[PDB]
Tab-separated table of C-alpha atoms and ligand atoms in Angstrom:
chain	number	residue	atom	x	y	z
A	12	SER	CA	41.549	4.115	-4.052
A	13	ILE	CA	41.275	0.788	-2.225
A	14	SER	CA	43.468	1.835	0.755
A	15	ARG	CA	40.880	4.552	1.713
A	16	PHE	CA	38.447	1.709	2.022
A	17	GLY	CA	40.843	-0.441	4.079
A	18	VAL	CA	40.106	-3.429	1.954
A	19	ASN	CA	42.705	-6.115	1.455
A	20	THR	CA	43.241	-8.049	-1.890
A	21	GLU	CA	41.214	-10.987	-0.673
A	22	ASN	CA	38.058	-8.906	-0.134
A	23	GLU	CA	38.846	-6.797	-3.181
A	24	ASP	CA	38.636	-9.982	-5.173
A	25	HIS	CA	35.317	-10.833	-3.649
A	26	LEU	CA	34.083	-7.296	-4.404
A	27	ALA	CA	35.228	-7.565	-8.015
A	28	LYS	CA	32.974	-10.629	-8.360
A	29	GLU	CA	29.934	-8.830	-6.841
A	30	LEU	CA	30.549	-5.739	-8.993
A	31	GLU	CA	30.092	-7.831	-12.084
A	32	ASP	CA	26.386	-7.039	-11.494
A	33	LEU	CA	26.911	-3.243	-11.117
A	34	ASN	CA	24.688	-2.412	-14.145
A	35	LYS	CA	22.143	-5.120	-13.214
A	36	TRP	CA	18.990	-5.254	-11.082
A	37	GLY	CA	20.291	-8.473	-9.585
A	38	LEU	CA	23.334	-6.862	-7.775
A	39	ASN	CA	23.510	-7.953	-4.172
A	40	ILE	CA	24.177	-4.761	-2.087
A	41	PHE	CA	24.267	-6.739	1.167
A	42	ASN	CA	27.284	-8.714	-0.175
A	43	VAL	CA	28.921	-5.368	-1.194
A	44	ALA	CA	28.578	-3.985	2.298
A	45	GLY	CA	30.012	-7.271	3.649
A	46	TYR	CA	33.194	-6.947	1.658
A	47	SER	CA	33.637	-3.199	2.090
A	48	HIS	CA	33.857	-2.840	5.868
A	49	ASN	CA	30.284	-1.753	5.697
A	50	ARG	CA	30.755	1.220	3.377
A	51	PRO	CA	28.408	0.122	0.617
A	52	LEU	CA	27.199	3.591	-0.397
A	53	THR	CA	30.744	4.931	-0.873
A	54	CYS	CA	31.872	1.738	-2.682
A	55	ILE	CA	28.914	1.476	-5.001
A	56	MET	CA	28.958	5.215	-5.695
A	57	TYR	CA	32.706	5.143	-6.497
A	58	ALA	CA	32.037	2.197	-8.822
A	59	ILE	CA	29.093	4.024	-10.497
A	60	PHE	CA	31.021	7.217	-11.019
A	61	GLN	CA	34.004	5.253	-12.476
A	62	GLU	CA	31.639	3.273	-14.670
A	63	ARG	CA	29.979	6.469	-15.998
A	64	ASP	CA	33.193	8.550	-16.144
A	65	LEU	CA	31.429	11.148	-14.020
A	66	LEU	CA	34.647	11.994	-12.136
A	67	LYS	CA	36.384	12.869	-15.393
A	68	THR	CA	33.412	14.717	-16.863
A	69	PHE	CA	32.918	16.951	-13.730
A	70	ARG	CA	36.551	17.043	-12.667
A	71	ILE	CA	36.113	15.476	-9.288
A	72	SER	CA	39.354	14.057	-7.901
A	73	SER	CA	39.006	10.562	-6.358
A	74	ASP	CA	40.257	12.132	-3.132
A	75	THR	CA	37.510	14.702	-2.929
A	76	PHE	CA	34.843	12.173	-4.015
A	77	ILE	CA	35.799	9.486	-1.516
A	78	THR	CA	36.265	12.019	1.383
A	79	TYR	CA	32.815	13.468	0.666
A	80	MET	CA	31.126	9.955	0.287
A	81	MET	CA	32.783	8.553	3.350
A	82	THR	CA	31.603	11.641	5.248
A	83	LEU	CA	28.105	11.404	3.864
A	84	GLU	CA	27.837	7.681	4.576
A	85	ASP	CA	29.020	8.329	8.072
A	86	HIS	CA	25.872	10.541	8.600
A	87	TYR	CA	23.567	7.672	7.879
A	88	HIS	CA	22.690	6.011	11.189
A	89	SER	CA	24.094	2.383	11.158
A	90	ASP	CA	21.780	1.606	14.184
A	91	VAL	CA	18.654	2.450	12.216
A	92	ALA	CA	17.399	-0.781	10.687
A	93	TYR	CA	16.231	0.221	7.246
A	94	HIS	CA	17.023	3.859	6.461
A	95	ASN	CA	20.742	3.484	6.790
A	96	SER	CA	23.624	3.657	4.159
A	97	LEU	CA	22.756	0.220	2.808
A	98	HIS	CA	19.265	1.453	1.676
A	99	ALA	CA	20.887	4.619	0.178
A	100	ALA	CA	23.423	2.497	-1.689
A	101	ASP	CA	20.520	0.348	-2.971
A	102	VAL	CA	18.661	3.332	-4.201
A	103	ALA	CA	21.744	4.860	-5.876
A	104	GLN	CA	22.591	1.620	-7.686
A	105	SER	CA	18.951	1.030	-8.714
A	106	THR	CA	18.858	4.526	-10.013
A	107	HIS	CA	22.143	3.868	-11.798
A	108	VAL	CA	20.345	0.972	-13.636
A	109	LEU	CA	17.155	2.810	-14.414
A	110	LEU	CA	19.155	5.652	-16.080
A	111	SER	CA	20.518	3.106	-18.539
A	112	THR	CA	17.130	1.742	-19.516
A	113	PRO	CA	16.944	1.347	-23.375
A	114	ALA	CA	13.940	3.633	-23.642
A	115	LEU	CA	15.799	6.595	-22.149
A	116	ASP	CA	19.051	6.229	-24.130
A	117	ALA	CA	20.705	9.542	-24.832
A	118	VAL	CA	17.792	11.434	-23.269
A	119	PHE	CA	19.520	12.903	-20.161
A	120	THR	CA	22.602	15.230	-19.945
A	121	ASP	CA	25.574	14.308	-17.888
A	122	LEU	CA	24.579	16.920	-15.309
A	123	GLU	CA	21.160	15.368	-14.942
A	124	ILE	CA	22.692	11.990	-14.595
A	125	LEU	CA	24.943	13.290	-11.859
A	126	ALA	CA	22.072	14.991	-10.241
A	127	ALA	CA	19.868	11.854	-10.084
A	128	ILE	CA	22.525	9.509	-8.622
A	129	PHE	CA	23.647	12.188	-6.117
A	130	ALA	CA	20.002	12.676	-5.075
A	131	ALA	CA	19.630	8.953	-4.544
A	132	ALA	CA	22.762	8.783	-2.384
A	133	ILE	CA	21.794	11.719	-0.032
A	134	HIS	CA	18.060	11.232	-0.030
A	135	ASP	CA	17.802	9.645	3.470
A	136	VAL	CA	20.956	11.004	5.130
A	137	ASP	CA	20.785	11.479	8.902
A	138	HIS	CA	17.432	9.600	9.003
A	139	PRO	CA	16.563	9.000	12.691
A	140	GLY	CA	14.467	5.874	12.033
A	141	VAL	CA	11.104	7.597	12.880
A	142	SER	CA	8.464	9.142	10.711
A	143	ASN	CA	7.689	12.839	10.004
A	144	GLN	CA	4.570	12.461	12.039
A	145	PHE	CA	6.610	11.217	15.006
A	146	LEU	CA	8.912	14.242	14.874
A	147	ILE	CA	5.905	16.570	14.565
A	148	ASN	CA	4.025	14.881	17.535
A	149	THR	CA	7.050	15.126	19.839
A	150	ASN	CA	7.480	18.775	19.017
A	151	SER	CA	10.888	17.989	17.571
A	152	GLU	CA	13.136	21.004	16.846
A	153	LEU	CA	13.504	19.643	13.314
A	154	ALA	CA	9.691	19.778	12.810
A	155	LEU	CA	9.633	23.335	14.248
A	156	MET	CA	12.414	24.477	11.886
A	157	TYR	CA	10.633	23.079	8.813
A	158	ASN	CA	7.095	23.921	9.791
A	159	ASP	CA	5.935	20.229	9.780
A	160	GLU	CA	6.367	20.031	5.998
A	161	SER	CA	8.495	17.245	4.373
A	162	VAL	CA	10.591	17.497	7.599
A	163	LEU	CA	13.041	14.664	7.124
A	164	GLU	CA	13.276	15.193	3.329
A	165	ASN	CA	14.222	18.866	3.779
A	166	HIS	CA	16.721	17.750	6.502
A	167	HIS	CA	18.207	15.067	4.146
A	168	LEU	CA	18.856	17.750	1.556
A	169	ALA	CA	20.324	20.314	3.999
A	170	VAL	CA	22.740	17.747	5.416
A	171	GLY	CA	23.676	16.421	1.988
A	172	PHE	CA	24.599	19.883	0.677
A	173	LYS	CA	26.045	21.120	4.011
A	174	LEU	CA	28.602	18.263	4.108
A	175	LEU	CA	30.074	19.624	0.955
A	176	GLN	CA	31.748	22.304	3.057
A	177	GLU	CA	33.798	20.015	5.289
A	178	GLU	CA	37.551	19.504	4.540
A	179	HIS	CA	38.176	18.204	1.028
A	180	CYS	CA	34.485	17.397	0.436
A	181	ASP	CA	33.387	19.779	-2.349
A	182	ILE	CA	32.729	17.414	-5.177
A	183	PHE	CA	30.966	20.236	-7.079
A	184	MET	CA	33.929	22.667	-6.829
A	185	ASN	CA	34.622	22.494	-10.556
A	186	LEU	CA	31.090	22.818	-11.847
A	187	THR	CA	30.222	26.428	-12.913
A	188	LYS	CA	27.753	28.458	-10.896
A	189	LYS	CA	25.043	27.807	-13.455
A	190	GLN	CA	25.691	24.010	-13.427
A	191	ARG	CA	25.628	23.992	-9.630
A	192	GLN	CA	22.363	25.935	-9.447
A	193	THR	CA	20.753	23.633	-12.079
A	194	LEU	CA	21.956	20.503	-10.333
A	195	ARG	CA	20.795	21.825	-6.939
A	196	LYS	CA	17.337	22.634	-8.288
A	197	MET	CA	16.958	19.083	-9.684
A	198	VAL	CA	18.338	17.391	-6.576
A	199	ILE	CA	16.016	19.311	-4.333
A	200	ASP	CA	13.167	18.366	-6.587
A	201	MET	CA	14.015	14.646	-6.620
A	202	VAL	CA	14.639	14.354	-2.828
A	203	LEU	CA	11.478	16.199	-1.947
A	204	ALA	CA	9.553	13.826	-4.225
A	205	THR	CA	10.610	10.909	-2.013
A	206	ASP	CA	8.065	12.097	0.668
A	207	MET	CA	5.380	9.330	0.494
A	208	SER	CA	2.758	11.996	1.060
A	209	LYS	CA	3.434	13.136	-2.559
A	210	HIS	CA	3.059	9.698	-4.011
A	211	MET	CA	-0.417	9.950	-5.503
A	212	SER	CA	0.506	13.320	-6.908
A	213	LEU	CA	3.686	11.943	-8.573
A	214	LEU	CA	1.842	8.957	-9.908
A	215	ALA	CA	-1.063	11.045	-11.384
A	216	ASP	CA	1.516	13.309	-13.127
A	217	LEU	CA	3.442	10.321	-14.417
A	218	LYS	CA	0.337	8.687	-15.870
A	219	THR	CA	-0.831	11.955	-17.417
A	220	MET	CA	2.570	12.199	-19.118
A	221	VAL	CA	2.491	8.601	-20.470
A	222	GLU	CA	-0.848	9.508	-22.080
A	223	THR	CA	1.057	11.953	-24.339
A	224	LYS	CA	4.358	10.030	-24.776
A	225	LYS	CA	6.343	11.140	-27.789
A	226	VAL	CA	8.573	8.206	-28.801
A	227	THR	CA	10.922	8.044	-31.788
A	228	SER	CA	11.367	5.389	-34.502
A	229	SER	CA	13.787	3.253	-32.385
A	230	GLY	CA	11.279	3.398	-29.494
A	231	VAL	CA	13.426	5.916	-27.534
A	232	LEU	CA	11.431	8.376	-25.526
A	233	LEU	CA	11.627	12.006	-26.611
A	234	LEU	CA	11.886	14.594	-23.763
A	235	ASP	CA	12.829	18.038	-25.148
A	236	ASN	CA	11.428	20.167	-22.301
A	237	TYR	CA	13.114	20.417	-18.931
A	238	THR	CA	9.788	20.070	-17.053
A	239	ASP	CA	9.281	16.603	-18.590
A	240	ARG	CA	12.804	15.522	-17.998
A	241	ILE	CA	12.745	16.389	-14.321
A	242	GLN	CA	9.343	14.742	-13.852
A	243	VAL	CA	10.732	11.478	-15.256
A	244	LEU	CA	13.802	11.804	-13.028
A	245	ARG	CA	11.840	12.457	-9.817
A	246	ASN	CA	9.661	9.491	-10.650
A	247	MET	CA	12.766	7.450	-11.428
A	248	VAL	CA	14.314	8.142	-7.988
A	249	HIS	CA	10.915	7.433	-6.421
A	250	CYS	CA	10.709	4.070	-8.301
A	251	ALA	CA	14.241	3.141	-7.076
A	252	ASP	CA	13.212	4.064	-3.523
A	253	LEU	CA	10.190	1.726	-3.891
A	254	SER	CA	12.098	-1.012	-5.787
A	255	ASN	CA	12.528	-3.451	-2.905
A	256	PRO	CA	9.512	-5.623	-3.923
A	257	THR	CA	10.797	-5.792	-7.514
A	258	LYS	CA	14.109	-7.471	-6.474
A	259	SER	CA	14.783	-11.213	-6.084
A	260	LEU	CA	12.880	-12.530	-3.149
A	261	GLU	CA	16.179	-13.176	-1.311
A	262	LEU	CA	16.843	-9.422	-1.286
A	263	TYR	CA	13.169	-8.271	-1.022
A	264	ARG	CA	12.777	-10.378	2.194
A	265	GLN	CA	15.776	-8.806	3.820
A	266	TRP	CA	14.449	-5.386	3.034
A	267	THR	CA	11.077	-6.378	4.539
A	268	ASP	CA	12.721	-7.614	7.817
A	269	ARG	CA	14.515	-4.281	8.074
A	270	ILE	CA	11.604	-1.905	7.383
A	271	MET	CA	9.559	-3.890	9.885
A	272	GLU	CA	12.299	-3.832	12.482
A	273	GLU	CA	12.522	-0.020	12.116
A	274	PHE	CA	8.794	0.354	12.472
A	275	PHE	CA	8.815	-1.748	15.632
A	276	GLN	CA	11.677	0.298	16.975
A	277	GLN	CA	9.563	3.445	16.473
A	278	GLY	CA	6.628	1.629	18.185
A	279	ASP	CA	9.078	1.068	21.084
A	280	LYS	CA	9.956	4.775	21.217
A	281	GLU	CA	6.217	5.662	21.226
A	282	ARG	CA	5.509	3.254	24.094
A	283	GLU	CA	8.624	4.597	25.936
A	284	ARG	CA	7.385	8.130	25.578
A	285	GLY	CA	3.773	7.508	26.544
A	286	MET	CA	2.499	7.995	23.041
A	287	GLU	CA	-0.099	5.884	21.282
A	288	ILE	CA	1.526	3.209	19.082
A	289	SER	CA	1.442	3.920	15.306
A	290	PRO	CA	-0.125	1.496	12.753
A	291	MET	CA	2.216	-1.266	11.873
A	292	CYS	CA	4.661	-0.320	14.563
A	293	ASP	CA	3.417	-2.883	17.096
A	294	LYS	CA	5.207	-6.251	16.713
A	295	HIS	CA	2.488	-8.113	18.574
A	296	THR	CA	-0.288	-6.961	16.215
A	297	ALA	CA	1.681	-6.671	12.984
A	298	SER	CA	0.734	-8.622	9.779
A	299	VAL	CA	3.910	-8.504	7.731
A	300	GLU	CA	2.644	-10.522	4.842
A	301	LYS	CA	-0.708	-8.798	4.535
A	302	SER	CA	1.026	-5.324	4.722
A	303	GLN	CA	3.431	-6.238	1.921
A	304	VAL	CA	0.567	-7.401	-0.403
A	305	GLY	CA	-1.360	-4.246	0.372
A	306	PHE	CA	1.754	-2.155	-0.077
A	307	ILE	CA	2.313	-3.693	-3.596
A	308	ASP	CA	-1.316	-3.648	-4.795
A	309	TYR	CA	-1.996	-0.091	-3.726
A	310	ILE	CA	1.321	1.634	-4.101
A	311	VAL	CA	4.244	-0.290	-5.636
A	312	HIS	CA	2.484	-2.124	-8.453
A	313	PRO	CA	0.432	1.010	-9.580
A	314	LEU	CA	3.694	2.884	-9.700
A	315	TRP	CA	5.853	0.346	-11.546
A	316	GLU	CA	3.006	-0.514	-13.948
A	317	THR	CA	2.919	3.088	-15.042
A	318	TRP	CA	6.737	3.305	-15.219
A	319	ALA	CA	6.881	0.095	-17.276
A	320	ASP	CA	4.282	1.608	-19.607
A	321	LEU	CA	6.456	4.726	-20.067
A	322	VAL	CA	9.596	2.649	-20.896
A	323	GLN	CA	7.968	-0.488	-22.311
A	324	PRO	CA	9.040	-3.119	-22.717
A	325	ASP	CA	12.150	-2.427	-20.613
A	326	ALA	CA	10.643	-3.012	-17.188
A	327	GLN	CA	8.672	-6.219	-18.056
A	328	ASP	CA	10.990	-8.562	-16.052
A	329	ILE	CA	10.793	-6.178	-13.113
A	330	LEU	CA	6.991	-6.220	-13.316
A	331	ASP	CA	6.953	-10.073	-13.479
A	332	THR	CA	9.232	-10.381	-10.366
A	333	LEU	CA	7.043	-7.895	-8.475
A	334	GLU	CA	3.784	-9.861	-9.167
A	335	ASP	CA	5.717	-13.108	-8.430
A	336	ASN	CA	6.836	-11.806	-5.068
A	337	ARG	CA	3.424	-10.335	-4.443
A	338	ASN	CA	1.716	-13.713	-4.742
A	339	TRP	CA	4.434	-15.374	-2.623
A	340	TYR	CA	3.670	-12.981	0.256
A	341	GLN	CA	-0.081	-13.509	-0.498
A	342	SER	CA	0.125	-17.270	-0.043
A	343	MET	CA	2.410	-16.723	3.000
A	344	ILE	CA	-0.439	-15.037	4.896
A	345	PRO	CA	-1.438	-17.346	7.797
A	346	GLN	CA	-4.520	-19.410	6.832
A	347	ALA	CA	-4.257	-19.496	2.995
A	348	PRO	CA	-4.934	-23.017	1.641
A	349	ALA	CA	-4.088	-22.203	-2.028
A	350	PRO	CA	-0.734	-23.386	-3.276
A	351	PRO	CA	0.942	-21.951	-0.070
A	352	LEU	CA	4.391	-21.118	-1.316
A	353	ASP	CA	4.515	-19.264	-4.668
A	354	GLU	CA	1.307	-18.204	-6.463
A	355	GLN	CA	-2.499	-17.613	-6.552
B	10	ROL	C1	9.796	-3.794	2.228
B	10	ROL	O1	8.673	-2.937	2.557
B	10	ROL	C2	8.904	-1.532	2.509
B	10	ROL	C3	10.012	-0.886	1.946
B	10	ROL	C4	10.154	0.520	2.027
B	10	ROL	C5	9.137	1.352	2.627
B	10	ROL	C6	9.176	2.851	2.745
B	10	ROL	C7	8.959	3.486	1.356
B	10	ROL	N1	9.981	4.583	1.413
B	10	ROL	C8	10.902	4.492	2.357
B	10	ROL	O2	11.933	5.081	2.386
B	10	ROL	C9	10.418	3.487	3.334
B	10	ROL	C10	7.970	0.637	3.099
B	10	ROL	C11	7.849	-0.726	3.063
B	10	ROL	O3	6.763	-1.518	3.440
B	10	ROL	C12	5.514	-0.824	3.866
B	10	ROL	C13	4.372	-1.748	3.898
B	10	ROL	C14	4.454	-2.430	5.253
B	10	ROL	C15	5.468	-1.689	6.098
B	10	ROL	C16	5.650	-0.398	5.264
B	11	ARS	AS1	34.669	-0.331	-3.564
B	12	MN	MN1	12.610	8.548	3.252
B	13	ZN	ZN1	14.741	5.954	0.831
């Protein structure tokens, strides 16, 4: 319902144009935020759920869905540069596209689809804009409560599920106990897997799964066991979370400006509190370009190359864009006299 969004017909028309790319990697979530009074997570999630008929399938009224999403979105910190609702909306939409990749057609159940998109939406809720290590070093009550393990990730899950209890917010009210327990188990698994400290582990397990891929005649992956399905799902959400470098440079650059701004803000807090400044959190000694190239070579590319192998050739374009953006940042590093603007 558009009136909940407070959007007039003029901006609704603008939104309709942007949403033409709802099922595409090229969607511009920044534009979506701009035409939705900065409620991109709720807008894109409502769009996704309408698109996939999830509201009908799981009997979620639009009232309950929008009330919960608007409540959840409000728990993302708009003053945090990167980990705000715009990033969550981006991850949810990116996950929405990955679920529809050809190679995974008809592989997942509706509940698993609901679980992955929901996980993407709540995966960074109430993020304070500082790392787990910062919370641990300041003796944060949050770190004490979670025993320094996946502190924020555990917190994101607790908040996401806890908000279901506010007035008219239980979007899972009509799922059976069994369905809720299974969805909850999957969501917890997917959000916990977003902890970067688990990256190498997730990657190894993904590669070791691709080595024994069981594909059908049509080239459609075959995943009969739950264990394999949830491993593909946690890696999928993890890929969406690290999809910024795979988007058009216009979007990627905005994501880079934001993550750097957030790191610098943490660096400011560390300085303010008499703490040593963390790596890449000092604006005066930061190497944005170099950091992005390293980030891609050592983390993003290794991950996407493996995913693209699992769903080949679905992710070829994404792989090309990534490498294209990687080289752009490479030649952008101060002091690089090799076609300084787009390649080797
Ligand atoms: C656009 O870049 C980046 C985008 C996203 C992230 C993190 C991954 N998971 C998150 O939720 C935040 C790091 C980035 O860059 C790194 C390399 C240099 C700074 C940190
Ligand atoms: As909308
Ligand atoms: Mn995170
Ligand atoms: Zn995230």
